[PDB]
Amino acid sequence: KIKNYQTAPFDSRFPNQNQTRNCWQNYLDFHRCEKAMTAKGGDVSVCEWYRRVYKSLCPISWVSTWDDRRAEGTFPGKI
Amino acid sequence: ASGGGVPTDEEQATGLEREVMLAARKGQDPYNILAPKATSGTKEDPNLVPSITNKRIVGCICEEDNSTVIWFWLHKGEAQRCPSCGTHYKLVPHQLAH
Amino acid sequence: HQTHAYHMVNPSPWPLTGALSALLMTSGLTMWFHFNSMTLLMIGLTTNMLTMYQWWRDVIRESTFQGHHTPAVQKGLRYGMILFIISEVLFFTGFFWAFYHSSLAPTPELGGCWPPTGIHPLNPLEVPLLNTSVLLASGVSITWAHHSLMEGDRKHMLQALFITITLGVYFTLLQASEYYEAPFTISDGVYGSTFFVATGFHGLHVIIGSTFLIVCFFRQLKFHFTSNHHFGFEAAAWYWHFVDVVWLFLYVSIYWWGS
Amino acid sequence: HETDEEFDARWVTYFNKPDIDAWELRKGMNTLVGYDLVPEPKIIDAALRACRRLNDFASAVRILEVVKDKAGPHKEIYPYVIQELRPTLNELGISTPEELGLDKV
Amino acid sequence: ASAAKGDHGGTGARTWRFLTFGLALPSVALCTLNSWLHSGHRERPAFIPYHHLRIRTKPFSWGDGNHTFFHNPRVNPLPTGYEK
Amino acid sequence: APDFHDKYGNAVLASGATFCVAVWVYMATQIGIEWNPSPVGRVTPKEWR
Amino acid sequence: HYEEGPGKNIPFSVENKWRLLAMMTLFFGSGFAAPFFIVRHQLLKK
Amino acid sequence: FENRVAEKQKLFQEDNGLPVHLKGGATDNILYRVTMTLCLGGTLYSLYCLGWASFPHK
Amino acid sequence: ITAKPAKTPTSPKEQAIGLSVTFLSFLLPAGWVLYHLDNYKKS
Amino acid sequence: SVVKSEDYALPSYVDRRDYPLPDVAHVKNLSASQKALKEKEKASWSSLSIDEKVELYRLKFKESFAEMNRSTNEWKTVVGAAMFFIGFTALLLIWEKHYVYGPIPHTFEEEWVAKQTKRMLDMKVAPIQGFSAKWDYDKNEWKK
Amino acid sequence: MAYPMQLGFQDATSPIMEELLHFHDHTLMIVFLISSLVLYIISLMLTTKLTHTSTMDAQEVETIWTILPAIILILIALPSLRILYMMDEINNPSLTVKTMGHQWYWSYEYTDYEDLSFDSYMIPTSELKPGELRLLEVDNRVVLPMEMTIRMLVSSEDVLHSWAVPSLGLKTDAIPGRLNQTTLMSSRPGLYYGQCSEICGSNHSFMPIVLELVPLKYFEKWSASML
Amino acid sequence: STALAKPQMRGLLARRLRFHIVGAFMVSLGFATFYKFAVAEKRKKAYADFYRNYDSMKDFEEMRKAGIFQSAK
Amino acid sequence: MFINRWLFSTNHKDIGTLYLLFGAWAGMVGTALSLLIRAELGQPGTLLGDDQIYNVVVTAHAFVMIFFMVMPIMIGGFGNWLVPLMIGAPDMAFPRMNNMSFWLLPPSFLLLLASSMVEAGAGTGWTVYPPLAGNLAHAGASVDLTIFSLHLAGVSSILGAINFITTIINMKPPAMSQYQTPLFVWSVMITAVLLLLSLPVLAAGITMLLTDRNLNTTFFDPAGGGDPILYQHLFWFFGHPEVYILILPGFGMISHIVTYYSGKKEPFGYMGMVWAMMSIGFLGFIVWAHHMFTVGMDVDTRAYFTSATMIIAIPTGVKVFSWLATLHGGNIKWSPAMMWALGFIFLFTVGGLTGIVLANSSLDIVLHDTYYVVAHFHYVLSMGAVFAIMGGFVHWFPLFSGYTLNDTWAKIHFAIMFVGVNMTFFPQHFLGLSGMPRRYSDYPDAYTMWNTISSMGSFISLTAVMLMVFIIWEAFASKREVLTVDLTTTNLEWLNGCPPPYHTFEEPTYVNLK
Ligand SMILES: CCCCCCCCCCCCCCCCCC(=O)OCC(COC(=O)CCCCCCCCCCCCCCCCC)OC(=O)CCCCCCCCCCCCCCCCC
Ligand code: HEA
Ligand SMILES: CCCCC/C=C\C/C=C\C/C=C/C/C=C\CCCC(=O)O[C@H](COC(=O)CCCCCCCCCCCCCCCCC)COP(=O)(O)OCCN
Ligand SMILES: CCCCCC/C=C\CCCCCCCCCC(=O)O[C@H](COC(=O)CCCCCCCCCCCCCCC)COP(=O)(O)OC[C@@H](O)CO
Ligand SMILES: CCCCCCCCCCO[C@@H]1O[C@H](CO)[C@@H](O[C@H]2O[C@H](CO)[C@@H](O)[C@H](O)[C@@H]2O)[C@@H](O)[C@H]1O
Ligand code: CUA
Ligand SMILES: [Cu+2]
Ligand SMILES: [Mg+2]
Ligand code: NA
Ligand SMILES: [Zn+2]
């Protein structure tokens, strides 16, 4: 549905050297989306761009900590 | 609304604060709080430099706004002249607080 | 015999005891944080208080009793107190800067929002607003004390000053009770860190300012102040207004805007 | 601030004051040698004659010295100046530093 | 602003006392009212062991090392949750 | 009357200089200091793999 | 009052130049040596 | 209270050569000695503590 | 500046002594630590 | 003629090319013949002899311009002494190399360097100017 | 890498580092002219017996000496800020690689498609292979495609570090809780070296960076084989 | 015995300064000229010439074959 | 008598004397630390075999030189001796507080010594950045002893600043305006305003670090929502004004020494020199993030900090050209103080110039945290400042002691020091351009030659330093008493004799208005 993914493209919302909020925002968008789908008995596949974008950008240890904290119920962002 | 009970400096000031206050009252300045005014500074009309001893340092600002001040010891005796501008200064020694 | 108006001070041990009391307080905080002991710190705090007490006692002997404060001396001390309040305003500025830095760009660990997830701020329209009216009122009363003194009115100077001091104490006890009631702590992230360090150093300054006004109260009771010569009272008032203004910035910044 | 002719006449008059005193002699010479010039013979001539009126032969020789000094490496300047003052030097009986051997180190 | 009052003839001791008892202390009484009236224990929130809160990178230099200096058992949970 | 410099100047200049050149040339060349200068124009490259 | 004049406005004696040598030695020598003995100290703790 | 500042002005301007921190009398001496004993004693004890803390206590 | 002749002249010999003792006071204690660094490193 | 510490507040003598007429005479107490010389100076200077004229100069001034401006040999003591202490420094460094420094890493052995230089050229280190630029890869030698 | 007796910068491997060299050459020429004009004037002022000690008027000369520096500074700032904005312009990278600093080694994550990551430690001197470089080689180099714009994202999992490669003109601090970005483009294949550039404890001197730049098809196979 | 001509007697220090400041500016132009040619243009030409016919695949193949890479043998 | 004079002092000159003694002794500690640094680097491989000790040595070297050598000597030492003498004042405004500022320094220095003796010392760099300075990567008392050391040095210099500003504003003769005080007295007043404003912010930031390490705050800790980079902004918000604080009294001393030995009554363009110091002191507050060009800062922030940093070169150049113009036309006396001052004009200019290369955030990417920065600041800071201190010390030594130095020995000392510092630091430019990181205990093999030469230069400066100690001994040993001093008419501090009486200006000077 419009692919050929190499890496995350420039995003004009996050145009500077600190990219922490870019990684965070795409992690949030992916999981929010996947909440919406999974629930609405829709399909997780539409959430893919955000999965691709955050996996490219986010340190593995950060994704992994945020994933543990979601399971634990102590993740501080709203999903 | 009013009432008293607070001392005044006249009543309670002491030591050097009181000396300075009582001298100001008579328009004298024994503790060098004010800048002296220049005379014409000629040999006939020398600036007169009070001192309590026989020599005092003078700084001369030769012209208004000069940033450089000219410093020299002024000795009791005949008038001396600033080494830069020649204006005359003569020492007038002695004494203070009775 | 001098013929300038400045004060040559007698040789004094208080500079060395204050310097040694700094060594004992700081090495004593090290011993408390690391070696589980309060002994050095208690000695340093005690010498610091002895040093302050004898030191400022001597300043009063020199002024009220010996007459060393000529107008030129007094003007010096004015500049000195203004320069000091300026250094304190800068110290505060670094804590405001920490507060704004953390709150305007909340990080992912916080939830990306301010106040962080899981923080419930105090309501600024409750005790915090009471504290604002209490300090602003003490700025009015101390100004009444100042006009009473200048006018020669012993009993109203006293009463306006007592009221100022009571309002300072009341702010201290209200803030102490807020600290106890607050559901967040200094260890609750940068929210708790900024809140308690900034308000805590402000709290310390209210206590120092109220002690300075209490010393003025006792000096006024012993008739030290003349209706025209009372710099210790003016310095304490300036410092008190400083503490009142820092409070207003804290209230607008942390309690109101940061809630 | 002024022409060269006016500067020189100012200084000529200064030293020509008949009752110029010893202080005023020393103040003139000491201030004059602060400028970026070698003094004209006419200024020097007036200052030498001031030395005469003040009975001070030593300062007249010192004045000749300071002329040579102010010329720095321009060797042609001092002999030109001495040339020009020769009638005054003869008239007042002022010997040059070189004639008194005070140029040797 | 002038505020909404008047005087300025002179700001002497009488005027500052008038402000102390006629504006400043009445404000303090009002806010004391309003506060001690919106007081009374609000009900505490579910404990959630968020990793950004209840920080402990070193034991505190007092008590058991794990209680804050103005610890209030009713409203300050420990890292492991509210006290028993 | 000759001062110190008139008497000892030539001597202090000439031995200080000889001495200084001697002991630096010796430190720099005889005691095993590795200066690590450029290989260019001086090392023959040798197979390493 | 206090002594004044060359050699008297200082908290050390310059009365004897050999005792002053010893003093200046200990003074400057102890500041210069201190970092060496601090490095030795740290290397000796392991 | 009454104003006793004049008494105090006389005490402290007494021409006895005492420095201001000792001019009030024997109590100034005692307080001075307690303060200097605590600063010097506490300073010797901070050095002791550095001595102690300078070495590993295994 | 002009000054008076020395009140207690320090002859060349005395200068060689003060210079030599000054230099040793910086050189020897530091020499000693540095010379023994290995003795320290392997304790 | 003796200058004392207690005279610091009084005008003093100086020889300076830029202050050629100092505040006081070099000689303040004259001998009897120095005095009559002062007396003679009030008459025509043409009747003074060269020695009288020389001695009138020496009573007013200490040194002449030629004298006070003379160059000296101090530069030789300063430069040779500075060389000497610089040379002494090298004794210190020789001591430190002998007694303090142990052997340097094996990577500075001649054979290691030859190999490392080959590997730097195989990886074309600084090929545009710095290093490999200086090797002739066609002729297999350093560029001449 | 640097080589023995080097005086200036490592040769440029990237178009940006080449720009920096030419900008350094322009600024150094300014620095040398100024420092030697000042040394020259000092010698000039000290070499004449001519004197002039009366008061000198300053308000003419102070124009020259304010305008002329102001102009020189503008002549440095112009090319300076051109480079600065040029490094900053939108790049479109083909690849993103993360590096995390640790005490005392780097880890790299290439997670655009597969989950590839590894650690990269200095080769100890006793373990070097003949011809290899003391303090510079690592076990696992950062392999990357040559002639391709790569986005590097830098962070740390403990104290600060800083990831630097001098010949590519690169240095970006590595801060825990922060993801900094920089972009890398090599004009040439080869091995390009750097070292940690923010003090991070006893082994700060011993956590180097080695880039290995090769054609995309080698990079692709190398990646696949590191899974 | 002939008279000495009158020489320049005024502003000799100012004259000396003007002369040398001027000569210092000349020397600054000279040095810039030399330096543009010996450093700055040399660099530009070194890079220009190096890349003009550069072949990055050939450079890689030579490095691959010298055994330098971990990823390419 | 001794205790009263030297422990309970309320006298500006004696307090100044104690600051000079303290600073001299600190300069020996700092020098020994610098020689340890350069020994470690003097050949490839390890010397200390322990790089935590190397980093502790690096950190202490910087804290000792800056806080315990330069500031005490220049502001405590010359400031106190010279400032009241130069305005005809009878003492400082707060002559008893003046003495606490002195006495806080030995305890501050003792804390810093304690930090290096306990645990494994604080091997943090003098920036003390978290997280390396926090309680996990530096557990234990050492870093907190460093923080307390800096607290005590901060209170010292803040009370000093208040006392000097007050003294200089309140205690001149009634006729002398601010535009009639000597450049050295303006350089002190402006150093003091910088200290007053910059230290309280360093204090807030290190107090936040102390609370991070001990009270579970997280200002600089991302787990609690903090940011390491907040600390750098608070530190450099102080640290850049600190570098102007370290040079401004040396610029005041240089203006006095050049004027004097050029035989001039006054410095060229006085009000230009006042304006230049105020301009530099002001700009010194809006440039600090040039210390942070690689932390990941927006391109517009970098462009601004580059352009604002460069502008400082304009007023600084007016000073350099105005010193040249004060030499111009002078009757030059080639005294040893004059040689220090001429070597200061040239070497400060070199170093300010490499600061302007670094101000370019584009080049600073490659130069940041390399030896090019260490080279820059050893020219402009270590030599600038050290040459101003040595020129001021040799110049005023006879005022403070009553005794003359041997000038030949002092020319020798200068020659040696000059050769040493340039052999030491000039090669460090090449090391930085070629990429050698700073804060390293060892270096890739290609860096050996310039590091070897730099280490041998260090030993030359050591010889110069031993020699200075001897030169001072020889002065006190010989007791040549000062008789006459030229140019007193424009150098008021000399007019009461050498050494001046305990109390000077008991009768103030007389200055007319007109
Ligand atoms: C100490 C070891 C010296 C090693 C020298 C180089 C070896 C050549 C081999 C090798 C054979 C040469 C072939 C290789 C070409 C190099 C290409 C390059 O990329 O080039 C970039 C290079 C260019 O570097 C050079 O071209 C080296 C020359 C140094 C600059 C001029 C100063 C000369 C004085 C040096 C004497 C030593 C200490 C005294 C310096 C005094 C302080 C400045 O690196 C620099 O930019 C460093 C400059 C730092 C900035 C300081 C600026 C102001 C300096 C002072 C000027 C004083 C005026 C008179 C100067 C007055 C003289 C006193
Ligand atoms: C005396 C102390 C001192 C002084 C006065 C200065 C002066 C300056 N410094 Fe420096 N500086 C330091 C001490 C000093 N510095 C220290 C200690 C550090 C490192 C800290 C650390 O990390 O530990 C440092 C670090 C430092 C950096 C950070 C580099 C890095 O870490 O990457 C930068 C960045 O811009 C900077 C720039 C400057 C500039 C532009 C000046 C300017 O103020 C200089 C202006 C002077 C001149 C330009 C020369 C005179 C002028 C002329 C002759 C006129 C004509 C000139 C031109 C037109 C250019 N300095
Ligand atoms: C009521 C008004 C406030 C008065 C403060 C009372 C306590 C003791 C004295 C110190 C006062 C101010 C110092 C400010 C610094 C630290 C924080 C203090 C503010 C405070 O008191 O905060 C309390 C935490 O206290 C803690 O850790 C207390 C730990 C006490 C250790 C003191 C800190 C020592 C280190 C600071 C040294 C200061 C150095 C500054 C130097 C000045 C610069 C020259 C908050 O309580 P909590 O249980 O976390 O939360 C409440 C939940 N119910
Ligand atoms: C429970 C206690 C714990 C608290 C810890 C600290 C303790 C509290 C300290 C409270 C401060 C008390 C200050 C008392 C000063 C009294 C002496 C005084 O006020 O001295 C006056 C001069 O003022 C002067 O020195 C002005 C003096 C300036 C004093 C400034 C005080 C502020 C000190 C603040 C310490 C801050 C630390 C902040 C932490 C970051 C005397 O001159 P006058 O009044 O004109 O009298 C003369 C007339 O009588 C003649 O007619
Ligand atoms: C960075 C600053 C340092 C600069 C260079 C220091 C210069 C050296 C000065 C000499 O120092 C000494 O020299 C020794 C040897 O030459 C030592 O003797 C050692 O050597 C011996 C002979 O090898 C024995 O006799 C002794 O036990 C002894 O410990 C030693 O104790 C030491 O004081
Ligand atoms: Cu990692 Cu330095
Ligand atoms: Cu800076
Ligand atoms: Mg860095
Ligand atoms: Na090493
Ligand atoms: Zn005058």
Strand, coil or helix: C10: coil
CB of M55 closer than 6 A to ligand 1?
no
Name the closest-CA residue to atom 25, ligand 3.
Answer: E69
Instruction: List all chains that touch chain J, counting a touch as 3 or more CB pairs closer than 8 Å.
Output: B, D, F, I, K, L, M
Helix (H) or strand (E) holding C100: helix C71-104
Strand, coil or helix: M370: strand
Same domain, residue pair K83 and K102: no
Q: What does residue M191 show for φ and ψ, rounded to 5 degrees?
A: -55, -50
Strand, coil or helix: C146: helix
CA distance D53 to M229: 81
Of M90, M96, M158, the CB nearest to C2: M90
Sign of the Cα torsion E47, E50, E51, E55 reads negative
Any idea what the Cα angle at residue M497 is, between residues M494 and M499, rounded to 5°? 95
Strand, coil or helix: B47: strand
> What is chain A's Cα-based Rg?
13
Kindly report each contact of residues D4-10 with a partner whose C-beta sits within 8 Å and lies 24 or more positions away, as own/partner: D4/L10, D8/D40, D8/D42, D8/D43
Read off the tokens for C43: 């000695």
CA distance M143 to M149: 10
Same domain, residue pair K82 and K162: no
Which residue carries 């008419």 as its tokens? M489
Q: The domain spanning residue E10 has which CATH number?
A: 4.10.95.10
Q: The domain spanning residue C14 has which CATH number?
A: 1.10.287.70
Q: The domain spanning residue H34 has which CATH number?
A: 4.10.91.10
Q: Is M333 a catalytic residue?
A: no
Read off the tokens for E66: 């794990």
Same domain, residue pair K111 and K183: yes
Q: Quote the DSSP letter at residue M93.
A: S
G27 CB within 8 Å of a chain I CB: no
Q: Quote the DSSP letter at residue C153.
A: B
CA distance C167 to C171: 6
Sign of the Cα torsion M289, M290, M295, M299 reads positive
Distance C157 CA to ligand 7 centre (A): 51
Domains of chain M are: 2-514 (1.20.210.10)
- Our count of domains for chain B comes to 1
The range of the structural domain enclosing residue C187 comes to 69-259
Give CA torsion, residues M258, M263, M269, M270, to 10 deg: 80
Minimal Cα distance from M324: which residue of L?
L17
CATH topology for L2-73 is Cytochrome C Oxidase; Chain I (4.10.93)
Give CA torsion, residues M359, M365, M369, M374, to 10 deg: -40
Q: What is the residue-wise DSSP string for K104-121?
A: TEEEEEE-SSS-EEEEE-
Q: The domain spanning residue C124 has which CATH number?
A: 1.20.120.80
Sign of the Cα torsion F35, F39, F41, F44 reads positive
CA distance M103 to C20: 8
Q: Please state the residue numbers annotated as binding site of K.
A: 161, 196, 198, 200, 204, 207
Q: Quote the DSSP letter at residue C108.
A: G
Of M255, M326, M370, M382, which one is the catalytic site residue?
M255
**Cα–Cα distance list, K155 to A62, A68, G36, K110, M435 (Å):** 11, 20, 38, 14, 22
CA distance C18 to C55: 9
Which residue carries 């500046």 as its tokens? I1
Distance D63 CA to ligand 10 centre (A): 25
Q: Residue by residue, what is the 3-state secondary structure of M391-425?
A: HHHHHHHHHHHCECCCHHHHHHHHHHHHHHHHHHH
Read off the tokens for C230: 């009372």
Closest CA–CA distance from residue F19 to any residue of chain M (Å): 15
Domains of chain G are: 1-46 (4.10.49.10)
Helix (H) or strand (E) holding C150: helix C127-150
Taking alpha carbons only, the member of M314, M347, M334, M353 closest to residue M258 is: M334
Last residue of a domain, one of C68, C91, C117: C68
B-chain CB neighbours of M505 within 8 Å are: 57
Of M91, M144, M212, M364, which one is the catalytic site residue?
M91
The range of the structural domain enclosing residue E44 comes to 1-84
The range of the structural domain enclosing residue F4 comes to 1-49
Taking alpha carbons only, the member of H51, G22, G36 closest to residue M28 is: G36
Of M138, M151, M240, M302, which one is the catalytic site residue?
M240
Strand, coil or helix: H7: helix
M28 CB within 8 Å of a chain C CB: no
Distance C196 CA to ligand 3 centre (A): 7
Name the closest-CA residue to atom 26, ligand 4.
Answer: C232
D91 class by beta-carbon count within 10 Å (0-12 exposed, 13-18 middle, 19+ buried): middle
Longest dimension (CA), chain L: 97
Longest dimension (CA), chain E: 65
Q: Which residues are CB-contacts of C144 (< 8 A; sequence separation ≥ 6)?
A: C156, C160, E13, E16, E17, E19, E20
CA distance C15 to M27: 25
Q: What is the residue-wise DSSP string for M125-172?
A: TTTT-TTTTSTTTT-SHHHHHHHHHHHHHHHHHHHHHHHHHHHHHH-S
Same domain, residue pair C62 and C75: no
Read off the tokens for M374: 């260490």
CATH annotation of A1-79:
1.10.10.140
F-chain CB neighbours of M452 within 8 Å are: 33, 35-36
Q: Whose atoms come closest to the Cα of K205: which ligand?
A: 6
Q: Quote the DSSP letter at residue E70.
A: T
- Our count of domains for chain H comes to 1
For residue E50, the one-letter residue type is Y
The helix/strand count (H/E) of chain K reads as: 3, 10
Give CA torsion, residues M276, M277, M282, M288, to 10 deg: 100
Closest CA–CA distance from residue M225 to any residue of chain E (Å): 7
Domains of chain D are: 1-105 (1.25.40.40)
CB of K141 closer than 6 A to ligand 6?
no
Of M19, M81, M126, M379, which one is the catalytic site residue?
M126
Taking alpha carbons only, the member of C104, C61, C118, C105 closest to residue C232 is: C61
Read off the tokens for M477: 């040993």
Q: The domain spanning residue K69 has which CATH number?
A: 1.10.287.90
M484 CB within 8 Å of a chain B CB: no
- Our count of domains for chain K comes to 2
Experimental technique: X-ray
Q: Is M319 a catalytic residue?
A: yes
Q: Residue by residue, what is the 3-state secondary structure of K118-161?
A: EEECECCHHHCCCCCCCCCCECCCEEEECCCCEEEEEEECCCCE
Any idea what the Cα angle at residue J74 is, between residues M468 and J16, rounded to 5°? 100
A window 42-61, beta carbon within 8 A of K: 55-61
- Alpha carbon C10 to chain centroid distance? 29
The range of the structural domain enclosing residue H37 comes to 1-58
CATH annotation of J1-144:
1.10.442.10
- Alpha carbon C173 to chain centroid distance? 15
Question: In which region does residue F48 sit, left (phi positive, over 0), alpha (psi from -120 to 50) or beta (all else)?
Answer: alpha
- Our count of domains for chain F comes to 1
Q: Quote the DSSP letter at residue J62.
A: S
Same domain, residue pair C60 and C167: no
Read off the tokens for M259: 């004027």
Give CA torsion, residues M472, M477, M478, M482, to 10 deg: 60
- Our count of domains for chain I comes to 1
For residues M257 and K204, the answer to whether their CB atoms sit within 8 Å is: no
Taking alpha carbons only, the member of K31, K74, K39 closest to residue M351 is: K31
Name the closest-CA residue to atom 12, ligand 4.
Answer: C212
Minimal Cα distance from H58: which residue of G?
G45
For residues B17 and M495, the answer to whether their CB atoms sit within 8 Å is: no
Q: How many CB atoms lie within 10 A of CB M130?
A: 29
Length of chain H: 58
M-chain CB neighbours of A17 within 8 Å are: 296-298
Q: Which residues are CB-contacts of L49 (< 8 A; sequence separation ≥ 6)?
A: none
CA distance A18 to M295: 9
For residues K3 and M446, the answer to whether their CB atoms sit within 8 Å is: yes
Q: Is M290 a catalytic residue?
A: yes
Q: What is the bridge-based pairing of β-strands K142-145 and K209-214?
A: parallel
